[PDB]
Design a protein around this ligand. Structure first.
Ligand code: HEM
Ligand code: HEM
Ligand code: HEM
Ligand code: FE2
Ligand code: FE2
Ligand code: FE2
Ligand code: FE2
Ligand code: FE2
Ligand code: FE2
Ligand code: FE2
Ligand code: FE2
Ligand code: FE2
Ligand code: FE2
Ligand code: FE2
Ligand code: FE2
Ligand code: FE2
Ligand code: FE2
Ligand code: FE2
Ligand code: FE2
Ligand code: FE2
Ligand code: FE2
Ligand code: FE2
Ligand code: FE2
Ligand code: FE2
Lengths: 160, 160, 160, 160, 160, 160, 160
């Protein structure tokens, strides 16, 4: 009787595909930022990757509970920056994509009466707008102090 | 001058594709095993997933150090079991695949003189034969005590 | 004047040959039981091996004190099981062999007046009947609950 | 599929035979050195015996993992000294024997593609050259200060 | 019998000459960087010097073990920068020199069968590629934020 | 009814006479060894004296329990060395004397059915063979390193 | 093969019958002595009862190990005193009975070659002669200071 709405499972798998992409994008940005010297921003990027990992684990559990089958076989297309600002903007564009898919999804769950899944999307939505606030603030800072000083701020001295 | 052999980067990206697949396969097995009640085996599967995550992070770092570009965009094809034995056998088949790709890869690094990458593959190889010893032992146990008692052993009572 | 009865040294070297065999038999059973998944029984087998190691060290010391020369060059013939019950029965047959050699030996020491060596054999004898009680009990349990449940009981879940 | 190269199992069993011999040789030297009063050298000999025990346990595990059958039934021929220098020289000759068998063995594993076993022999090799450095140094010391002062140095006062 | 291949001792002495040079180059860079105010980079340079000291001590021990005679009498030619970027580039050029000598050397040890010395060079090689990753990253950072901001980042305030 | 076999009391009093002698011999050796400078051997001699004291107390208690009367009025003839080796040999000769009296005595207790006294002699016997092992080892050491180095080893520096 | 000599099991069951009697006799003496006010002697009697309990448990285990069947169905005839001295004398008479049965029994085990059971009787024998020493001493004290002062000594003040 716990069999879920197939449209709801579709939306959760759609969210999962986006999360898996975000996990990989953030992790590669972490390693790239590190190789370039921006170790403080690299660290924040690692943490963001791990937060998306947790979101992906929540979606899988909800999908399997609804007796759907979670798709981990494919990953959404990654946006890979080649300097700091591009990395921040690549991440921002991904969060806005996620925001819109979750906005759509909570409405679909609502209309079909799966209120617990609705609640799951509403929580992912507020998390994303969290990540979005952070990134927009960093990009505004980068813009007002300039890329090279933003880079220096987010870099460690050589003895660390 | 640190520019790496393109054949060596190819092999590391080939390893990365297999690791990312293994990460996803183990994680889904964790959640599936959990939904079926096999919580002790599910836990070991989570740990295995996280170990592969660490291997994938090592390959990315080596690829970026060699000034190659790591591919996280695609994931190797997953093997998804539908009961305990199939889960163990799906994992085993994946480890043997990894063993063979790393065996090939350390020989390619050796011939081309990239001894530090050789060492990286040799370490992944011994880890895989570790995972392989574990799984073959579990499958032998399953075979000698039978699937239902193996399942019970790897399940928790309801108060845990 | 501490020169010992040559017949007494012979008996101690005979005991040493049996102990060295038992040390090797128990250790191989430990590793085998482990490879098959029976990790709790494997652990007890390791401890038994180490106890025999200690017995072998006691015999060597007594032999050298009596100015005899301990023979470590050859090992008595090993009994190697191919499943749990055979492992337990191979060990039992070895302990009964040891019991009989020590029974004979304490009588030889007694008749020849080497009472301290007599005491050494009497202590090995009571230890062996200890090991014998343990094994007979395990085999009775195996018989009453059946090999597959005895195997499961002596196996660990996969997360350990 | 984990079935190992029979030539590789042969070499591991060959190593095991040498290790078991070394375990017994070092242990008997420990007890002998003790009976003669050279308690500090006796202690080091006990530790060496126990290190070889650990090497023997590693070989057994690798053999059983490769689905070979480890031979513990026979022990390689022991070299037994009758004074300090002979004990040190008997041990040295044994380590050089082991060095050469492991040198041969890592090359055989390499040619046949069993790189994890290669790594195992390379680790035993560096350990042996460790034991060899120690013994050559002790023998040089014995030579420069003379056997009786070397004996005194490696003996304890009577209250210990 | 521990007499080593003369070609192997030559290569270890060649490595020693390079290490001693690196020890002196890093130490002088430490003091120079300090005099110029770049105290955080100076500290990392001191640590690097001390790591090379440890490498030099490992080579000496291996040389004396192989009954060769280590040459400490001469030091390889030093590269001495006159500002931050030149200091980093002088160090990088030295590490690439070391990388190539160790690459050559492990192959010579391999061909001649001195596998433990091979392992020693392979460990120095991976350490050097470590130092090389660090320096290339610092130089990329210097390039993207500019020398004066890189200098400021690696300088301490006057109260420290 | 606890009245003991008069032959058994005789043997215990015979043992007591030997123990009291040994107590006095060891104690005088302690003080003598001390006056000569051999303070480490002197200490061991004090401990040996005190162990014999404990043996003498055990015999007295057993004698009084058997309602015999323990003879402390006379002491067996003492062996008093005039240098280190003579002290060790005087002690050894005394232990062999004790060994033989206890060997005889446990047989007399056995034949007459006083098994608890038998056990008492068997315990004194194993203690004596303990003391005998120690002394024979010390004398062998003295022989192989020479009296003057054995003396030095068992002497303390002047600040202790 | 662990089947025991039927004569040996008979003797152990004979010992068990005596121990069970002693357990009950000591316990009733404890309660009686308590009711009469002799609380310090009552306490010692409780401890003695519990020691016999432990002896009885040892005999049962040995009987079941020898695949005999322990008889707990009947208890040997109890000796119940009506004042302090009679209580002490009733206990003494019981210990002498036990002494003689164990003396007989160790000889029977010896002749039939069951040396581990021999050792068990020898240990019970020395324990009994322990209990016998204690009681004879208490009765001698009672005799020399008189029953009423012995009673007072073994009584507590009313506030305890
Ligand atoms: C389905 C995809 C993934 C899932 C479900 C997932 C899940 C998780 C979770 C729940 C943790 C928390 C472990 C802990 O700290 O207790 C974790 C940690 C981690 N993740 Fe992932 N993750 C995924 C993808 C990735 C990828 C692609 C990488 C690439 C390197 C990665 C790297 C790591 C690392 C290094 C850790 C740290 C583990 C440790 O500290 O021992 N993860 N992951
Ligand atoms: C003459 C034969 C042997 C003797 C005299 C002997 C003696 C001993 C002793 C006294 C110990 C106790 C060390 C301690 O825990 O403090 C020990 C430990 C051990 N034994 Fe043996 N043993 C023998 C045979 C073997 C064999 C054939 C193996 C095969 C692997 C083995 C494996 C071990 C191991 C792994 C340890 C643990 C050492 C540690 O924990 O560091 N032994 N042995
Ligand atoms: C210009 C030449 C040298 C300078 C300026 C120098 C300086 C120093 C200093 C200040 C330390 C103290 C580090 C500490 O313990 O906190 C040190 C440690 C050390 N030195 Fe040197 N040294 C020189 C040459 C050498 C050489 C040729 C070797 C050859 C092996 C060497 C081996 C070591 C080692 C092994 C340490 C220990 C570092 C540690 O404990 O981590 N040094 N050195
Ligand atoms: Fe966050
Ligand atoms: Fe997310
Ligand atoms: Fe997000
Ligand atoms: Fe693992
Ligand atoms: Fe992996
Ligand atoms: Fe793996
Ligand atoms: Fe045991
Ligand atoms: Fe034994
Ligand atoms: Fe045993
Ligand atoms: Fe060692
Ligand atoms: Fe070894
Ligand atoms: Fe060795
Ligand atoms: Fe470093
Ligand atoms: Fe270096
Ligand atoms: Fe370096
Ligand atoms: Fe002692
Ligand atoms: Fe004594
Ligand atoms: Fe004594
Ligand atoms: Fe008591
Ligand atoms: Fe009793
Ligand atoms: Fe009693």
């Amino acid at each position: 009787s716990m069999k879920g709405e197939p449209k709801v499972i579709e939306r959760l798998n759609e969210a999962l595909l986006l999360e898996l992409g975000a996990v990989n994008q953030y992790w590669l940005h972490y390693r790239l930022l590190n190789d370039w010297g921006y170790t403080r921003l690299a660290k924040k990027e690692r943490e963001e990757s791990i937060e998306e990992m947790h979101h992906a684990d929540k979606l899988i559990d909800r999908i399997i509970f609804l007796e759907g089958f979670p798709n981990l076989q494919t990953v959404s297309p990654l946006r890979i920056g080649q300097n700091v600002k591009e990395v921040l903007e690549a991440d921002l564009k991904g969060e806005y994509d996620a925001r819109a898919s979750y906005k759509e999804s909570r409405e679909i769950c609502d209309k079909l009466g799966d209120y617990v899944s609705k609640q799951l999307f509403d929580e992912l939505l507020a998390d994303e707008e969290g990540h979005i606030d952070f990134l927009e603030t960093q990009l505004d800072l980068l813009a007002k102090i300039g890329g090279e000083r933003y880079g220096q701020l987010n870099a460690a001295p050589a003895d660390e």
